[PDB]
Design a protein around this ligand. Structure first.
Ligand code: PC
Ligand code: PC
Ligand code: ZN
Ligand code: ZN
Ligand code: ZN
Ligand code: ZN
Ligand code: ZN
Ligand code: ZN
Ligand code: ZN
Ligand code: ZN
Ligand code: ZN
Ligand code: ZN
Lengths: 142, 142
């Protein structure tokens, strides 16, 4: 027996890190892609005669920042999972916790996008809110 | 000089298979987990004094069926991607198509869950719709 396992585990660690990095890119796309189309949909269908555009653009910049910080937390959670499997490559309490922590960051990204979507429609004049709701139904169903 | 490439490609194959396996698990969880909690949340917070329970249970059974069929399409799309890279391990038209097909199945799963969620609240008495909306805000934000 030698430091052979102490380098095989390091490989397992590095390998899971890369796997996670890619999955993480898919996670960030599975949330941003629908939000981007929904944003273009808002500009094309809903007006701004009381200049809600002023308010909305700030709200979006605030969201992109929160999005960036959850994204960072997800890279760190994946990193702690990569490092924990590099210590003990099995379902230990260390991995159990590190996995749930990845699931949480991924969920908190999807939840934050979802709250932003309703936060955006909140900052709209009732006349426009009805038009925003009517275009949501028309696009999701068809 | 040897079947070295015929085992390097097999590594590429196995590696993409693991990537896909994880992505797939994330996809099935990113949709089911919120829906399950949202369903329990409906039963605990919203009543049924006009027996909407009768209607809703049928709507859910119809959804679980559509969910099962999109889920099957996603396993088949991942399978055709696994088999195509096993033929030519590069960005060929075969892979180009098979990848877009995986993306579509994943999106169609998330979209179907989302439409179901609004389809469920549609079949509710206005008195209950307001209670269902008030509990959604309280749970997502906090
Ligand atoms: C070890 N354990 C089985 C009790 C908990 C680990 O979580 P899970 O594998 O049941 O999701
Ligand atoms: C747009 N497209 C995916 C159909 C073709 C573009 O080619 P490629 O950039 O995927 O190689
Ligand atoms: Zn937005
Ligand atoms: Zn107007
Ligand atoms: Zn101004
Ligand atoms: Zn904008
Ligand atoms: Zn979970
Ligand atoms: Zn439901
Ligand atoms: Zn309950
Ligand atoms: Zn009632
Ligand atoms: Zn039920
Ligand atoms: Zn895409």
């Amino acid at each position: 027996s030698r430091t052979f396992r102490l380098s095989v585990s390091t490989l397992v660690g590095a390998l899971v890190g890369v796997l996670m990095a890619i999955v993480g890119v898919y996670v960030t796309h599975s949330t941003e892609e629908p939000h981007t189309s929904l944003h273009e949909m808002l500009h094309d269908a809903v007006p701004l005669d009381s200049n809600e555009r002023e308010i909305l653009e700030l709200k979006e910049e605030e969201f992109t920042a929160r999005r960036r910080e959850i994204e960072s937390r997800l890279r760190a959670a994946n990193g702690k999972l990569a490092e924990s499997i590099a210590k003990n490559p099995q379902w230990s309490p260390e991995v159990e916790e590190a996995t749930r922590e990845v699931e949480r960051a991924a969920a908190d990204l999807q939840r934050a996008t979802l709250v932003h979507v309703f936060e955006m429609r909140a900052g709209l004049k009732p006349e426009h809110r009805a038009a925003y709701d009517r275009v949501l139904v028309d696009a999701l169903k068809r």
